[PDB]
Amino acid sequence: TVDRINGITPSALDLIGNTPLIALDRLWPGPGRLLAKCEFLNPTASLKDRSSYYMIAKAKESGQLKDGESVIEVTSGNQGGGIACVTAVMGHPFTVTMSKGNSPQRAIMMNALGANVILVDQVTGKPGNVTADDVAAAEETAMKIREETNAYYVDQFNNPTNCLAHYETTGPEIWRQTNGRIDAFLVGCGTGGCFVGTSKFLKEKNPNVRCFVVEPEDSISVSDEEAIEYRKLLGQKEGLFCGFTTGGNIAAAIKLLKSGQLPKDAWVVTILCDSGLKY
Amino acid sequence: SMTESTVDRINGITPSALDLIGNTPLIALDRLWPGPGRLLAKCEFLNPTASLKDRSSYYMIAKAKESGQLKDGESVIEVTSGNQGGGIACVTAVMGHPFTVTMSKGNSPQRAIMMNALGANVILVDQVTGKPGNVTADDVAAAEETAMKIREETNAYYVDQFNNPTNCLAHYETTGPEIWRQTNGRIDAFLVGCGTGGCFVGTSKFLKEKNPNVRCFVVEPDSISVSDEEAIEYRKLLGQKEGLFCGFTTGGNIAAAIKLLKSGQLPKDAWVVTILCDSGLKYP
Numbered sequence A: 001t002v003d004r005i006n007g008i009t010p011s012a013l014d015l016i017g018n019t020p021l022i023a024l025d026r027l028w029p030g031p032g033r034l035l036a037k038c039e040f041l042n043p044t045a046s047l048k049d050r051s052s053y054y055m056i057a058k059a060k061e062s063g064q065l066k067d068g069e070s071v072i073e074v075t076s077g078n079q080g081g082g083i084a085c086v087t088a089v090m091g092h093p094f095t096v097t098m099s100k101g102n103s104p105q106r107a108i109m110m111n112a113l114g115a116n117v118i119l120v121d122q123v124t125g126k127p128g129n130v131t132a133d134d135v136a137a138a139e140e141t142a143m144k145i146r147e148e149t150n151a152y153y154v155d156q157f158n159n160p161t162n163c164l165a166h167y168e169t170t171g172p173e174i175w176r177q178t179n180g181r182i183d184a185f186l187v188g189c190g191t192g193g194c195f196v197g198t199s200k201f202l203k204e205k206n207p208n209v210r211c212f213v214v215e216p217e218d219s220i221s222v223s224d225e226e227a228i229e230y231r232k233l234l235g236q237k238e239g240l241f242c243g244f245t246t247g248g249n250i251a252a253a254i255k256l257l258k259s260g261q262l263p264k265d266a267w268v269v270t271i272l273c274d275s276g277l278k279y
Numbered sequence B: 001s002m003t004e005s006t007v008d009r010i011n012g013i014t015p016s017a018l019d020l021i022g023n024t025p026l027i028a029l030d031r032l033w034p035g036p037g038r039l040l041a042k043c044e045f046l047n048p049t050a051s052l053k054d055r056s057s058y059y060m061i062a063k064a065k066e067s068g069q070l071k072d073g074e075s076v077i078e079v080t081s082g083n084q085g086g087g088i089a090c091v092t093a094v095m096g097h098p099f100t101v102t103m104s105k106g107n108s109p110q111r112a113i114m115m116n117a118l119g120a121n122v123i124l125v126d127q128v129t130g131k132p133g134n135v136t137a138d139d140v141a142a143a144e145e146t147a148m149k150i151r152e153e154t155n156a157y158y159v160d161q162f163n164n165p166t167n168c169l170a171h172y173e174t175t176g177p178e179i180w181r182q183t184n185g186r187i188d189a190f191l192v193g194c195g196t197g198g199c200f201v202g203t204s205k206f207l208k209e210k211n212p213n214v215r216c217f218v219v220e221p222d223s224i225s226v227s228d229e230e231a232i233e234y235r236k237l238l239g240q241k242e243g244l245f246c247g248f249t250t251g252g253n254i255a256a257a258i259k260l261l262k263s264g265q266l267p268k269d270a271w272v273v274t275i276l277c278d279s280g281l282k283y284p
């Protein structure tokens, strides 16, 4: 019932989701149409605000996370900022572990949103190069803190409410905003929550909607070169500065539009995942 | 436009980044300020370049087009290292105007990243008196001289933000009216810092027409002063209590608004509105 346009937004939680669906009609002038969800307009400037809100809100509803108790996650990425935002508003202490090998830039927003950032010594890597063993040491620090404090472990890769977020919000919004006119959806996979949750909802509304995973070097392959080139083109043609994964989603969507696999007049929807300012 | 729009951002399709400019949320900072009275703030960090400058950027380009000073597909030039250069880059990108920007080599290269990502042609100009980190009056004057030379050859429209009347107009026609609508006419005080002064002058002029009793304050580094330490402290508290990462000028705005609420100068149940000017991500 919140009116963001003509009323008061009660908290940052009300800024999560209901993102614009922008038409990229200058980047792709036809035939057919390319549209993308503006997930860079979430309060921490990534789609992770949706999964962060769900994982914390559902842990609270189930009674697994009690009023004012501590939360822990291992991350260097957008999910840390998202959880920090939601825990800040809801009054949960938040601890985050990440390798000292990450750029200090990766901690700035999480720390500004009240996260207790624990930098964990690299085991095998050097600065700018966080290895599997570096991350395994940050996971081990987080499990030790969790055992010592009874903190709620968010467990982004194994938490089912991650994909529920996109099934209940992202999917329904796209369906509403297109008034059901959508031939294809595509996005890359980290947790896979956005792809799995959105696609499940869209396929329930229209089973003929074609859902594609964008796979970095059913699926569309994209190189770092394509991601970079289309990140730049999105900025030059649409005035939107997004991250590398957004560049790959645009490159993939344009390959799909030219493929002739869809009708000539196809409407294709993807995701603008985050702000280019997060890099 | 921003004022004649039938675009439904929530339940329909947003035609372009231009339609993302303005109509920003007015957020209640009820955890940072639990009462009595209320602190609210415009989320200008949710503009497409993550600053309030998208509003003045759109007005300056659209009015130059309307007047016939800037013709279809013609070039634009500005001297800037700031949020204004990102805003003008966004608007020129969508509207199909080649955009050139000169700035001193004394600026952090971070200041050019977004402008360049949005297709601005960034020309870096040799410092005349200053050192890296320290851009002087003469360093800036040399950037202006480079831009005037390029403008002589290209006939580019010069934005000239500090002398452009449409700068103020943007806030009189958009920011003020939005705040008045979003509060349903409940506002006892408005405050913001001054750069160009466009936001303060435009917003305050509108609010005073709607409610002559409204008190308008300039935030200075009448008026409310804040130390660097206060701006930093309240930037941190805005993040910790409200989950919003904004720039240093936003910290200054919140410190001033909290000082005003605590002063007892306004009624106990006063509603105070300020501006969350930009994202903390635009800094190091």
Ligand SMILES: *Cc1c(COP(=O)(O)O)cnc(C)c1O
Pocket (backbone or CB within 6 Å): A046, A047, A048, A077, A078, A079, A188, A189, A190, A191, A192, A193, A194, A195, A243, A245, A246, A273, A274
């Ligand atoms: C998380 C993330 C993704 C992938 O989203 P999942 O729902 O985790 O699969 C893509 N791009 C960016 C920038 C992300 O932060």
Ligand SMILES: *Cc1c(COP(=O)(O)O)cnc(C)c1O
Pocket (backbone or CB within 6 Å): B051, B053, B082, B083, B084, B193, B194, B195, B196, B197, B198, B199, B200, B247, B249, B250, B277, B278
């Ligand atoms: C320009 C700017 C201001 C001041 O706004 P004016 O309308 O130019 O006075 C405040 N904060 C930020 C971040 C700005 O970029």
